[PDB]
């Protein structure tokens, strides 16, 4: 998380955490209540968030489910929903932790090798995470929308 | 050309070409007539083989030309036809060279980055070059099937 990031950055220079790092951790720990509440909100709408996220994705890129696509039947669409819930959980992990590194530790390192060995169009995965961001921001406060959109946007960028 | 590869290896070893290399270029030069025949046959029947393999690729992967795919739109399917033409011409160049260096350095090295930028499903192109392989084997002689299939297999494996 942000504490882990600060510790690693300080370890790189072989020094104690600077006052900037210390009061950044200060602000993060003080404001963690809002982050935990937003993680709770994202967790609660998990089934629906995945539901209309996948619906909008398929309406936007039906080729992934069309004849020739990676996920033709309800079985492979279910696998897409499974991966979709995976990356929703990853974004929740990032929100609670406050830093993107756990996402990198979980669902961003070697992802291109994953979705090349599987034939999945990674651009479609990015679009699905973008549908995450759009609908989730629709179902939450604007400032909280931006707070979650930071991690959704980072996942989108690592996609493309 | 295998002559360039052998010269490169000898220069790396700082030695004159070994008997294996000399025999390699000797067999290549003595058998250049068959490679030229393959090149002429591919050039003459390029337009039909590319169209047939593209049709078979469509039959395997209709989503590529579905409304929302990279090949959708007659412009965006003519561009697939042109890309298959380019790869067939590259294979023809390699057949008359004896090695895969021109294939590697004209359309293979950095192909993944280009097809990621354009969004093309590289595995679909692998299936397309496979279909080119079956079409060429059908139109071309049995003994030369091994020689042509070696290069097609190399292109498929590297670009898969």
């Amino acid at each position: 998380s942000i504490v882990t990031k600060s510790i690693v950055n300080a370890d790189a220079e072989a020094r104690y955490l600077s006052p900037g790092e210390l009061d950044r951790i200060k602000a993060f720990v003080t404001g963690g209540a809002a982050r935990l509440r937003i993680a709770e909100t994202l967790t609660g709408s998990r089934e629906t968030i995945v539901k209309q996220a996948g619906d909008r994705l398929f309406q936007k890129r039906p080729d992934i489910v069309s004849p020739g696509g990676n996920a033709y039947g309800e079985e492979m669409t279910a696998t897409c929903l499974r991966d979709m819930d995976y990356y929703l959980r990853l974004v929740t992990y990032g929100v609670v932790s406050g830093d993107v590194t756990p996402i990198e530790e979980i669902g961003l390192v070697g992802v291109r090798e994953m979705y090349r060995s599987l034939g999945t169009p990674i651009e479609a995965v990015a679009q699905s995470v973008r549908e995450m961001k759009e609908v989730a921001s629709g179902l939450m406060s604007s400032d909280d929308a931006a707070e979650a959109s930071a991690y959704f946007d980072f996942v989108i960028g690592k996609m493309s | 050309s295998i002559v360039t590869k052998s010269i490169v290896n000898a220069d790396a070893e700082a030695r004159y070409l070994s008997p294996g290399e000399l025999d390699r270029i000797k067999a290549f030069v003595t058998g250049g007539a068959a490679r030229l025949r393959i090149a002429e046959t591919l050039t003459g029947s390029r337009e039909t083989i590319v169209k047939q393999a593209g049709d078979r690729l469509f039959q395997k992967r209709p989503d590529i030309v579905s409304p929302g795919g990279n090949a959708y739109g007659e412009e965006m399917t003519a561009t697939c036809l042109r890309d298959m033409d380019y790869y067939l011409r590259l294979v023809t160049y390699g057949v008359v060279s004896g090695d895969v260096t021109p294939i590697e350095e004209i359309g293979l090295v950095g192909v993944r980055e280009m097809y990621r930028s354009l969004g093309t499903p590289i595995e679909a192109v692998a299936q397309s070059v496979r279909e080119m392989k079956e079409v060429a084997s059908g139109l071309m002689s049995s003994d030369d099937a091994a020689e042509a299939s070696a290069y097609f297999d190399f292109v498929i494996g590297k670009m898969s």
């Binding site: 004849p67 020739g68 033709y72 039947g73 079985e75 | 039959q59 209709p62």
Partner: peptide, 5 residues
């Protein structure tokens, strides 16, 4: 014309 699901 199909995909093995």
């Amino acid at each position: 014309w199909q995909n093995e699901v």
